[PDB]
Amino acid sequence: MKIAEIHVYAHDLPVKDGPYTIASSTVWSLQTTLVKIVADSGLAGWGETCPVGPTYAPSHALGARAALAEMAPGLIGANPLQPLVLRRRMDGLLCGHNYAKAAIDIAAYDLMGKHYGVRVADLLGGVAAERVPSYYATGIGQPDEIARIAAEKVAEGFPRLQIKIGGRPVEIDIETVRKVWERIRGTGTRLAVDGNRSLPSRDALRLSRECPEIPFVLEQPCNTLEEIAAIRGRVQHGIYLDESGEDLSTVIRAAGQGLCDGFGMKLTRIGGLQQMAAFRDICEARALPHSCDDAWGGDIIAAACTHIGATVQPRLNEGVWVAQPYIAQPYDEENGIRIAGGHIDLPKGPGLGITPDESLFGPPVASFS
Amino acid sequence: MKIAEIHVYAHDLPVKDGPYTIASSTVWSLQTTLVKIVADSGLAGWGETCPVGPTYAPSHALGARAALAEMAPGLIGANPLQPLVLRRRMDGLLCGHNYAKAAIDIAAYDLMGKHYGVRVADLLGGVAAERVPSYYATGIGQPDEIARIAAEKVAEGFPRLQIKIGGRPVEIDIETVRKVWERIRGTGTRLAVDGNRSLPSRDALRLSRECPEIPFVLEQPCNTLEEIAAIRGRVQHGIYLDESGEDLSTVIRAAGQGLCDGFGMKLTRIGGLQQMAAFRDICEARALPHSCDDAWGGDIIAAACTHIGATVQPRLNEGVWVAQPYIAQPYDEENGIRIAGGHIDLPKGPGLGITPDESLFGPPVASFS
Amino acid sequence: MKIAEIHVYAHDLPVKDGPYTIASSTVWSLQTTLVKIVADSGLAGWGETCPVGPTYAPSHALGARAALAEMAPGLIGANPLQPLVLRRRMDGLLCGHNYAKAAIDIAAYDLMGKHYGVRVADLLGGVAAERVPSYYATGIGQPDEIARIAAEKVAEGFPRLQIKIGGRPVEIDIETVRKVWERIRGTGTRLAVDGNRSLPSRDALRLSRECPEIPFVLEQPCNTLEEIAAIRGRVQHGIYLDESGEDLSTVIRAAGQGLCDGFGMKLTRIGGLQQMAAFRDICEARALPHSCDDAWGGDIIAAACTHIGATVQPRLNEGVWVAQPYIAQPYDEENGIRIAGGHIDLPKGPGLGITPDESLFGPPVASFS
Amino acid sequence: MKIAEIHVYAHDLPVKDGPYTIASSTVWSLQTTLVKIVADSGLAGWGETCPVGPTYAPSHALGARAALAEMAPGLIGANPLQPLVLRRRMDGLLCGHNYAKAAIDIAAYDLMGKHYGVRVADLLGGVAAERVPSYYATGIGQPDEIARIAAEKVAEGFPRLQIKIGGRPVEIDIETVRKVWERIRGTGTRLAVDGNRSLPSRDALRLSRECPEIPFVLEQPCNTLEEIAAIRGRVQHGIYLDESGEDLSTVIRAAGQGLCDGFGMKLTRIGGLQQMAAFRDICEARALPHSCDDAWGGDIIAAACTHIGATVQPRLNEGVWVAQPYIAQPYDEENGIRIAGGHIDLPKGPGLGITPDESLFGPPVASFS
Ligand SMILES: C[N+]1(C)CCC[C@H]1C(=O)O
Ligand SMILES: C[N+]1(C)CCC[C@H]1C(=O)O
């Protein structure tokens, strides 16, 4: 089988009741990029990449489309049923840009699943769970307000909460953490506190030192892995990497040298499902819990995250985060990804189990044949 | 789909022109263990595990059969199309015993390939090369005799040689290395020198120190990874791990802490194809060349090694070693694995591409349903 | 003063006597991106960024233009005479993408120099030398052909040569190094050998071990800084970082932990002149020799590299590499950067000292006001 | 342009309501040294260096004047518009003595700013803030007395307090810290506790161990960087370096090896504004908060500190400390540096924005032409 066509789409995603405030990025609307790969036979697979604002990570919508434009001509004729060979071919056309490569990777897995009549999770090792936990991530806000939302989302069924902090005096972050804990203690809910690269080591040290009785993991408190490695021995809370986990090589360093206790991992950042599966296997060998998330996006990226999420050993699964609650219009009205009771059901159909309504996207902004 | 039956077989393989002498194991004949998994549909898949004598590694033929007998009843009804789920189910029945688990893993991949109409290499990421390099491993012997054999094997087309050493005064090993190099220098042939756990650090240091102009990698010179880690900074030849690479966790330590420059990796030791693919991905991220080998065995294990080997980035592929030259009777005379010109052509059919003449194996020593 | 307009240009530069072969990138023509910043006063400054093919580094021409388009609207009204404030403003609009940010940075320095009537080198600490050394980088090729070219370039007056290697059996690289040394020994010519991320540690170890009598520095032998850190203690030749030196934070790690002995540093990679000056100061504090280069490009980027190069302590200056010998048409035929006798004379006028014939560039692909 | 004359002045600064008590130095009056550089054109720039007693650091007033006398003849004819070239010229005349070199560096930046018509901050990267935070540093005193002063200075508007400790039993220091915290908790005021090289590791360990709920950073608790590195892993409060930060090389060690969480940095110690800017850039890359201070002195050194302070990323700016509150007579009655509301306004004029009344200083004690 061979790739005959590649189509790139641009589509807007307004944030319901926005904005969503991360210490590194405040977003009111998101520009997603969809990719459709069409085989010689006419069979199609879909991929998606949607950076969460241009300042969260070294990625942006215009950049995704430029990277896809660079690679697409060189991918016509490739075998989409060989995800590792396909990844190497992409590497031969463009260095880096994992967030764009991931959209091609995902579309190829979708296509492969449809061709063989198999769910993507069953091409990645097998479904370990049909119902996948999610987690709720609060935007930065006022301490009492965030504590209220925390309680609300626990009641909805989320087994884990992530509280975003930073970009303001750390005593306000600490007050927020204490107030959230007062609401959720005794509910069996797991807690993560995400600094999103924004805390100097001075403040990360203080946050952990002041709160030994509060069982958070501290997610990406500082900007660089170098800073995190420097503070780790002085911090008695588990530390998770997120933004620092840019590639498999960095994951190997972190796990092999004992630099973290877990990960928030984004599928587009690591470069797609082929790489994400290897990441999963590394974490399982070292009992490092992790999530399977992305920055943002609709049914296509959400389904990809859910499929890899469904393969994770349940005791290590910190959840699959999706943007669905903030997105008004699903691409697949029948079988799109939906959070229910703080969890996500894996789609039943072959491939990703998603069939997007292309008419929602408008005509492609770029087509390659 | 579900596993309906599991059949375990004992089969003998005497060494042509034996014995084969490893510093840790001398063998005149080998006892292999075959596994047949039968689905409800009637479709079957094959696996194999064959320790190279009982002293090379913590594994033996009677042990392989004991481990399989322990796990088999608990695997009836499992979905054979989910290799990671299947591995976890095995872990729930028996701790360790990767060499036995690998036989089930391989049979599952064979079954998956047959069911979907796909080659096993394509289920593991894709065929990067239809023909893979092999390497010739010499036995321990007289320096000039080993040098003659080395020259002969280069003339046959082997792109790499592994010279076994140890178990005698190291000056004889050094003379062997020097005489081999005299005959193969300028042929572009790669060289490995394998101590097979037998050299005290005293002698590993001496071998490297005396021969800076000879471009070998030093494979498993010392018994423990601890000894290797202690000598590495004082040894200017690349060092490869073989026997020490017992699981993915150990590979993560070695790669993440920079304890070696490559691997001789055995499929059964790491626990099968699911784990081997993860191993491959770790090595590729860090440009660590490796082989895809096993201890011994016929067409089934050989085909499994060849399939994973066919997925490796060619610049990192140190070869696929197979016991075929020492085995009188192939399981599959039409499609069985054969070395030609120091290389191995990947089988072209679905699954492993191997159809063993099951009659050769005798009745099962144990059957489960 | 305020930015009134920003104009982005696409322009082609085919390689004379191409292609130019790097182990990580082979190129027959280059697409450069020019930026013109216009102040309210009407005064203009120029910047440039030109990746050397899309596979050398995580940067490409379409990406440079996407990044500039993303940032430009948010820069209208900014004070162009404040390079650090301007860099922070860019960081607030787009994460990463140093190669694109560098073009804005360079245009700002050009504008500042023109406004104050000062050469850019004097804004960066002062002209230490009116004429700076360059170095010649050979392509990958036959050992004796590369040796001939090396001899020719020494006769032209180049004080340093960089021999590119990798992407083939290392014995050929070693033969190349030996044949080059045979021809240039005793001429006082400095030697670097650049693996361009392509050597497994196995081969980097071998190259150094075999050639202690040849005084090269080994530049970016391996792909990751992690691999380089692992081999450094076993390699007795100085090791320089190039591609790994992605930002000032990484330079701080490398200098502070003693991970390298020098740098091949590219202005666009580090993010522009503001960051490059800090880099220079770090290297001077630790006596780490370095070059001031870029990936490719015409008079604008070349002049920027020459200006920072002119500020470096002469004993630490490994040279300024420019693409001029491979470029048919200069932007400025009166003052453009040219190699003469293996060295480069700094332009004498204010700003970068370059007045590009803007007509050459075509209409802007994007304009902002 | 060229230096035509250098004039060195001696001037006394009585401590208002003295003495000021540091654990390493008690001072009743300070001897400052002013430097005037006059260009061929007649244009002048001013610098200043004022050690805070002869025992605080390896520097003293008689030593400043001796160092300037050594260097001045060798600086006549130099280009004062090239601060890095000028620094190298000074290094070629005298090793070390940064505190004296800094006065020349500052005078040259002043001159450069006047010549180009630009504020010194805009020659160092640009004004990031017109109003710069300061911090108040209490001398050593009785616990209740210091707590009262702490409350008073918070009310005046200082966003940060530094409490000096040491030279007495540590339980008194701990009582002081607790009493200060009781007064300032809930005011959003940041806290530093400065041991000024005086605590044995025994007592630094105790101070941190006993007070996890008090959010100080521990500034230079021990005498040597070696002692600080030894205790750092056992101390859960952020540790800042001050006296140990003697040069850029030491800063590179501290940041690269993760030996501290921030700095109190003195402009004269680091060697002037050229070096201070590089220091600032290193800290910004690693999110290490820092102050921009000096040991003591009037309008000239204060303005230099304010100018570099105005370029610091606001979230990393721990403040600019100046001696103004303790100095009765400003050099520039109109535009001298004044603390107002715990903050300092950047002068508006070119150069440092300061014009000293030379008649206050008396005739030069040494003149060079
Ligand atoms: C909550 N998230 C999964 C969504 C956007 C950022 C990310 C995180 O930083 O964890
Ligand atoms: C060469 N071999 C693959 C064959 C058996 C042992 C093994 C080795 O020690 O490398």
Ligand SMILES: C[N+]1(C)CCC[C@H]1C(=O)O
């Ligand atoms: C020689 N160069 C400056 C030119 C392009 C790549 C580069 C280098 O790798 O060093």
Ligand SMILES: C[N+]1(C)CCC[C@H]1C(=O)O
């Ligand atoms: C408070 N100070 C800025 C002024 C003199 C000493 C110094 C300090 O040690 O932090």
Ligand SMILES: [Mg+2]
């Ligand atoms: Mg719950």
Ligand SMILES: [Mg+2]
């Ligand atoms: Mg996160």
Ligand SMILES: [Mg+2]
């Ligand atoms: Mg077509």
Ligand SMILES: [Mg+2]
């Ligand atoms: Mg050959």
Ligand SMILES: [Mg+2]
């Ligand atoms: Mg071996």
Ligand SMILES: [Mg+2]
């Ligand atoms: Mg010469």
Ligand SMILES: [Mg+2]
């Ligand atoms: Mg290079």
Ligand SMILES: [Mg+2]
């Ligand atoms: Mg206040």
Ligand SMILES: [Mg+2]
């Ligand atoms: Mg201090």
Ligand SMILES: [Mg+2]
């Ligand atoms: Mg004179």
